[PDB]
Amino acid sequence: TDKERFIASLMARMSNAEKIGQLRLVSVGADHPKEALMADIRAGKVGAIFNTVTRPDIRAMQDQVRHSRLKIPLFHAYDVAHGHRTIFPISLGLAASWDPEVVARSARISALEASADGLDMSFSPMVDITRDARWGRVSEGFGEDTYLTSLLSGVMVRAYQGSNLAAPDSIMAAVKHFALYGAAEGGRDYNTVDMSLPRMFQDYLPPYKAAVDAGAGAVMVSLNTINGVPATANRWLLTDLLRQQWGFKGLTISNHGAVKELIKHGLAGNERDATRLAIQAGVDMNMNDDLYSTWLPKLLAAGEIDQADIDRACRDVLAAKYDLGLFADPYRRLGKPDDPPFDTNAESRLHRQAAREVAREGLVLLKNRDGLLPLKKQGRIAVIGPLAKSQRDVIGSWSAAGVPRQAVTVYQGLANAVGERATLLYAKGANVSGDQAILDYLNSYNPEVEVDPRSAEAMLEEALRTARDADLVVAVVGESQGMAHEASSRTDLRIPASQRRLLKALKATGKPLVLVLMNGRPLSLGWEQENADAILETWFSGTEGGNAIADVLFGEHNPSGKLTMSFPRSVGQVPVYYNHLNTGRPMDGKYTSRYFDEANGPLYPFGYGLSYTEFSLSPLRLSSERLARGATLEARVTLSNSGKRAGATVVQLYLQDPVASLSRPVKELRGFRKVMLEPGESREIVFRLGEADLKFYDSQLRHTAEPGEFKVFVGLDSAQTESRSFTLL
Amino acid sequence: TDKERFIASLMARMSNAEKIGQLRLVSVGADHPKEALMADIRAGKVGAIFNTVTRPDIRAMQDQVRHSRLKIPLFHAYDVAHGHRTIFPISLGLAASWDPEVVARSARISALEASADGLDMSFSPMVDITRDARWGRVSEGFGEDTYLTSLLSGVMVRAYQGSNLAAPDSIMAAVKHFALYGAAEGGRDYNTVDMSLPRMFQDYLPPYKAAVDAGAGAVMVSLNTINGVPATANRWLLTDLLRQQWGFKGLTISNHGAVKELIKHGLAGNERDATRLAIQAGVDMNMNDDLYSTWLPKLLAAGEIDQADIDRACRDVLAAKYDLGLFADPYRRLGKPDDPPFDTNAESRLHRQAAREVAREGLVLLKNRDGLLPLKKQGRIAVIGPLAKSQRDVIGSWSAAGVPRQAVTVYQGLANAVGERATLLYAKGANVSGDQAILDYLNSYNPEVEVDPRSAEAMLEEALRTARDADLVVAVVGESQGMAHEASSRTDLRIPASQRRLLKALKATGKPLVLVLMNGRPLSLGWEQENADAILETWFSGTEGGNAIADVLFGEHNPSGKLTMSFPRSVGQVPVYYNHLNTGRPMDHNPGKYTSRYFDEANGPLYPFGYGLSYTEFSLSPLRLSSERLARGATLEARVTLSNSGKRAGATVVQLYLQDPVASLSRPVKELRGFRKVMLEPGESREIVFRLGEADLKFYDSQLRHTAEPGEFKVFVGLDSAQTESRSFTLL
Ligand SMILES: OC[C@H]1O[C@@H](O)[C@H](O)[C@@H](O)[C@@H]1O
Ligand SMILES: OC[C@H]1O[C@@H](O)[C@H](O)[C@@H](O)[C@@H]1O
Numbered sequence A: 001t002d003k004e005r006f007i008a009s010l011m012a013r014m015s016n017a018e019k020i021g022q023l024r025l026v027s028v029g030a031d032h033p034k035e036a037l038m039a040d041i042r043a044g045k046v047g048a049i050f051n052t053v054t055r056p057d058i059r060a061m062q063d064q065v066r067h068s069r070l071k072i073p074l075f076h077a078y079d080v081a082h083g084h085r086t087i088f089p090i091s092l093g094l095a096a097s098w099d100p101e102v103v104a105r106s107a108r109i110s111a112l113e114a115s116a117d118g119l120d121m122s123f124s125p126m127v128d129i130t131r132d133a134r135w136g137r138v139s140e141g142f143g144e145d146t147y148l149t150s151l152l153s154g155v156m157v158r159a160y161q162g163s164n165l166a167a168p169d170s171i172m173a174a175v176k177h178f179a180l181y182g183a184a185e186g187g188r189d190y191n192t193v194d195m196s197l198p199r200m201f202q203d204y205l206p207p208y209k210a211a212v213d214a215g216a217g218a219v220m221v222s223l224n225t226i227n228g229v230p231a232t233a234n235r236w237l238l239t240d241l242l243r244q245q246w247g248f249k250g251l252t253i254s255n256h257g258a259v260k261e262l263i264k265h266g267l268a269g270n271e272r273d274a275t276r277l278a279i280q281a282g283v284d285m286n287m288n289d290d291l292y293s294t295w296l297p298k299l300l301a302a303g304e305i306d307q308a309d310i311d312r313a314c315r316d317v318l319a320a321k322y323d324l325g326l327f328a329d330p331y332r333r334l335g336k337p338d339d340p341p342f343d344t345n346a347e348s349r350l351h352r353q354a355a356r357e358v359a360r361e362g363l364v365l366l367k368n369r370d371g372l373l374p375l376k377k378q379g380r381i382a383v384i385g386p387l388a389k390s391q392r393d394v395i396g397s398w399s400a401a402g403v404p405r406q407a408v409t410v411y412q413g414l415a416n417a418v419g420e421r422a423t424l425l426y427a428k429g430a431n432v433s434g435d436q437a438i439l440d441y442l443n444s445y446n447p448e449v450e451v452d453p454r455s456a457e458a459m460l461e462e463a464l465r466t467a468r469d470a471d472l473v474v475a476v477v478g479e480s481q482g483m484a485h486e487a488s489s490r491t492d493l494r495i496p497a498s499q500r501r502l503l504k505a506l507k508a509t510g511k512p513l514v515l516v517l518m519n520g521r522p523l524s525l526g527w528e529q530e531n532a533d534a535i536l537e538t539w540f541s542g543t544e545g546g547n548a549i550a551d552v553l554f555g556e557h558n559p560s561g562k563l564t565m566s567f568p569r570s571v572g573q574v575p576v577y578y579n580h581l582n583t584g585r586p587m588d589g590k591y592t593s594r595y596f597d598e599a600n601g602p603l604y605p606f607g608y609g610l611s612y613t614e615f616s617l618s619p620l621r622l623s624s625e626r627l628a629r630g631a632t633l634e635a636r637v638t639l640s641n642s643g644k645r646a647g648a649t650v651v652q653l654y655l656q657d658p659v660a661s662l663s664r665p666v667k668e669l670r671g672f673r674k675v676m677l678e679p680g681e682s683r684e685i686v687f688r689l690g691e692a693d694l695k696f697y698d699s700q701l702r703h704t705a706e707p708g709e710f711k712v713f714v715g716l717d718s719a720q721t722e723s724r725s726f727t728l729l
Numbered sequence B: 001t002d003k004e005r006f007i008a009s010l011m012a013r014m015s016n017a018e019k020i021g022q023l024r025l026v027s028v029g030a031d032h033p034k035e036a037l038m039a040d041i042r043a044g045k046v047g048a049i050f051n052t053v054t055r056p057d058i059r060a061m062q063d064q065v066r067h068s069r070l071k072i073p074l075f076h077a078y079d080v081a082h083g084h085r086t087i088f089p090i091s092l093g094l095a096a097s098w099d100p101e102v103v104a105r106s107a108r109i110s111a112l113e114a115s116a117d118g119l120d121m122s123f124s125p126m127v128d129i130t131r132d133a134r135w136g137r138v139s140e141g142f143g144e145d146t147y148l149t150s151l152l153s154g155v156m157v158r159a160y161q162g163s164n165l166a167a168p169d170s171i172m173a174a175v176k177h178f179a180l181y182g183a184a185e186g187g188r189d190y191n192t193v194d195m196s197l198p199r200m201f202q203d204y205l206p207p208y209k210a211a212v213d214a215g216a217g218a219v220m221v222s223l224n225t226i227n228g229v230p231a232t233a234n235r236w237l238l239t240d241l242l243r244q245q246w247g248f249k250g251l252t253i254s255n256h257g258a259v260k261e262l263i264k265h266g267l268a269g270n271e272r273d274a275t276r277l278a279i280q281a282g283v284d285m286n287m288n289d290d291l292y293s294t295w296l297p298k299l300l301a302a303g304e305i306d307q308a309d310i311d312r313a314c315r316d317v318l319a320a321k322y323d324l325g326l327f328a329d330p331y332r333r334l335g336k337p338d339d340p341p342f343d344t345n346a347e348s349r350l351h352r353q354a355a356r357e358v359a360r361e362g363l364v365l366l367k368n369r370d371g372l373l374p375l376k377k378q379g380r381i382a383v384i385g386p387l388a389k390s391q392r393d394v395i396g397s398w399s400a401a402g403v404p405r406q407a408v409t410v411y412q413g414l415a416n417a418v419g420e421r422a423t424l425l426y427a428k429g430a431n432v433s434g435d436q437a438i439l440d441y442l443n444s445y446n447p448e449v450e451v452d453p454r455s456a457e458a459m460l461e462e463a464l465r466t467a468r469d470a471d472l473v474v475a476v477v478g479e480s481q482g483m484a485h486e487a488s489s490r491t492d493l494r495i496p497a498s499q500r501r502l503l504k505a506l507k508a509t510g511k512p513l514v515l516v517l518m519n520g521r522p523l524s525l526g527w528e529q530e531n532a533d534a535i536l537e538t539w540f541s542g543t544e545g546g547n548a549i550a551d552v553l554f555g556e557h558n559p560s561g562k563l564t565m566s567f568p569r570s571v572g573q574v575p576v577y578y579n580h581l582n583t584g585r586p587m588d589h590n591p592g593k594y595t596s597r598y599f600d601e602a603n604g605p606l607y608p609f610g611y612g613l614s615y616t617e618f619s620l621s622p623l624r625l626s627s628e629r630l631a632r633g634a635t636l637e638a639r640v641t642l643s644n645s646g647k648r649a650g651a652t653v654v655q656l657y658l659q660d661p662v663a664s665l666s667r668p669v670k671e672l673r674g675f676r677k678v679m680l681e682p683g684e685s686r687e688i689v690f691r692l693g694e695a696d697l698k699f700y701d702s703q704l705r706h707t708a709e710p711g712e713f714k715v716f717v718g719l720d721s722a723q724t725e726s727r728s729f730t731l732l
């Protein structure tokens, strides 16, 4: 009530002009020249800033607040998605570590670095469920599984916000994108999402609720329609669900120009009506389009909105600012005015140990023919491909304040790891695409992709000549980070054709071929699975990616990472995901649910990933065959390292309700342990199962466990498991 | 109440054993040997038969009924989808005619032929909305548009059932598949369907309701889940919607083994519980698995079901049998006991005139560089490809009693059309697929696909040598009918790789290249659009396909057919459909990077909805609305003048689309709301007048309120969904 008292008496001091000013979130750009923005801050007409990311620059803004009547401090936000200055792997890569503590360490250090530069808030975590590999932004999520994405959503929020949001090394988590954004039709970004309420509540919503339950201070609203209604004008989503049902008590933030876009959605004929829909639906804070400042006064004058609409939004902004401690000290994350200046991008402000150690855990070994990996640090190694010496790509999309020049490439990683003991030979081999239209797209806003001016044939001859000089080729191939961005939807999930032509040429030299993959989404790797001697999935592995990849290639680390998203054989099988419904005619037969013109199932399933050692599980044992209401069951299995090398695997518990009021999925992830074992080491794993893990949203959204059979699965991926059954009473 | 009285007094006479017997629908096969089935009919334990399709064979069954106590007649059903013995184009092809009377003529003659053979019912029309070209069964539907599929659903039902269901040349329409079956995830057949109730009511359901409103005597229930609940156990779908809300008064029929499959759906641990869910959800008649006969007695004994559950289903079966006139004369479609025997597949029992005249209307001219088509009947024409001399494929999937041997191939069609005036040279050029696994699948039960024992290279050399001898190549390519069947879902929408290798070789000879396409779904034709000199979409055009294709190729007919389903550039763009939502960041075909689009391919469809070329040129005058305000209960007039401004007689389809740019839901960028197909002679002009009222402006909102909101409405008019002009009015 200290906070309630403080807020109530500040808002009793405030005019509607000052209140509406608090709802305005802007960045320096064409729409808002720097100096007219500073003038707006001095006049009490700006609530917050995004995309201003250095102490001197953020100090300069907060300094303008003393000129306003009430001196209400700004908060400063940025897209700290998977690192601020020290870049960790893209979220899809982090998820692949299957280790909350690893994911937490990336968020803690992100918060530490961003706070240290003056930032109060990150538009993070992105926790949208993704079953469509075509979608540009799958790189920003944690994959396709509801349980894993929901858990890591909670982990990220608690790591960022820490023990106290006032703390100088804590930032506010603004979870995104609320809601259902990953389910765009055709995987086209911003596009229509349409689904049943049972699927919505069971599969897609839980990650947002986890962020709320973990204490997320903010929620960012999505650009997409939900069953005909844009989320930004969806009163049901933002008021009935978010506030009245989940009990969210924080700040709602519009997406970039999302209020104005209600016109193109066909929900409003003009900006006046677009504003009314958004504030009355439950959008507090308006990003960039400034429709709130332009129209909220006139809507109130004409009775089209209530004072309570303005007050709800303003109180939310002030409560956020309060919990960040900005009313106690606006400069608590900006040092002291007499502090000596520093180089923001100084080497000593980075966390390279952390980045390298996190980057190792998420690398996924997909293929290793006749123990080719790990490599010895001897002989001549050809390092070939357009992503081998790429600093821009290895830090991935949404790379915040990450500096390309400070990033360790895959080539450099190998250079450092072999020293003078092996000879590395380099050849680019191909451009990332051989299609000038795709190169035009990738280089459209910024020059993201360095184009060799030579012919494909010239580059291939040079690559072939390098392979011939070498004992083995390490091909570094896949996507440029510009291919797994916002709006970068693909019709083709394969490696680009220029690089596939390179890989076939390289295969034909007869040299052992190791594939180091870079990608922000599941790829189509039919050919690579038949032909490559080994494949390593490195996603975009960040600032210290090259070192972490070199550590795994030379056996300093044993690949432990496993997929959190199913890899389709082709884009034609989209969507494919492990927790699908059985249907009345499950494919194992001509008259089953399947394609005829391709092998069925995914190439690599959910939970899949190889190691340099071999693991075994003892028989699955349940503590009983009946479970009483309010009692707790124990699934017990013994994991061994039955190979020669130390290493980690992930023991995954799945669950099936084979008889239910709805057709339930064939299995759903409900627990896991990542376990490091020395050779011969054994760990008894014990899973606790209760009524909470058996529940689902029925036809009428009743969240219920029904009595009857439950099947418990345990294995090292969703494909290779054993089941044992019990009964709920 | 004559019927109600009759039924009430029959059912008062009946035991539960006799009532449960009426719910049993079976076919002769492994599961039911012919003679044990006849014994079951005599014992009053069979309600109906499917897949028995000749008079002598159907007579033999109905003869067994006199041995039952109450002598309740059987009805006999079959899959008369697009013809019985004389096969018309696949439904997707029929839709492309944009002509109710053409679609009606195919259904009338289907009913006539099937009734003439003894059949009472067809599991038809299939009226499932299809936005996913990967799905095997898009060939059986009318495309992606709700308005067109809803209209043709009504047309098909009224054609089949005629003026009286008692009539000897009328059959009962059993509309399918209720419901949402075309929206399977991944386009994998039988697979999960999951959608909002606004999309369901606005886009997907109306065709089923049209069948009901047209007086469909029966509805067949789908195999797919709807939002977690199999349609077969979906009480909401079959009771609350179908009966209580739409007022359906006919018979519900399960799909093949659909009750038992509730176990694999994970809705039931056993057959006892699977039966209870299905009969209590509102499934009257049980197809093949016989769970109803095995379990309904014990469920009733133990109180797990009510007598009213049994009675509802039985009364429905009897009402269907009554309206077919089978209680007045079980042999009314089986002739008289004296009647002389005949050859069922006699040439004189076919309707070749009708099939040829219907097949012309749906052929779609996609490309015609420098008026190559129509061809003259002179010189040397190379006819190359694996579908050129294919009889089995041209009759398509769900070909009922259609005989391959009786079908006119594309080669034969051209042979008849040129007689002795031109030289046709033949070469197969490639096998339908070059993948032995796909050939194994296609030839798995029956040999559907003739594999040439020569090498691809040998066939290519022979094809190339034929092209060299010729003035122009007519390449006959696309899918085998086994590729657009039930469960034949594809990951690739292109022409098979063996035929694409053939087309590239042929292109490289420099000879004019005409593509005759055969397919049961939208194909990916990026390459063919850049490289072929002309493209003709022939779908599967049926028994008289070859003749109808030859008529269009030689200008006897002017291509009038237009697409009812959007053609994607690649499978990676699935789904693509004209009536999509704008989104908050629409791409402007002034491209932006941050719009709703793919980056690694051209965006939009290759060919849009309503698209199709002609041998002549048409013009439209400016669109004129009768006013700029429309009063509640009043009627607006959109008026345009269509001309033949070219040298040949021919038809086009003038299409009216509608947009509600401001609404409580984001509405589609446009929705089809009317059309005229118009034949014009050169220089001929016709003032077209569309009537628009409040009914055409309505939509299902967040809470399924079906209303027109006041405000702006935009009217579009053009010869396809791409190339239109708009004018606005206001509702008050
Ligand atoms: O710049 C901040 C925001 O910009 C928007 O364009 C994106 O949709 C958000 O996800 C992002 O966090
Ligand atoms: O063969 C009769 C019926 O069998 C079902 O399995 C099919 O799905 C229906 O379309 C068909 O009409």
Ligand SMILES: [Mg+2]
Binding pocket: A657, A658, A659, A660, A706, A707, A708, A709
């Ligand atoms: Mg149960």
Ligand SMILES: [Mg+2]
Binding pocket: B660, B661, B662, B663, B709, B710, B711, B712, B713
């Ligand atoms: Mg309106």
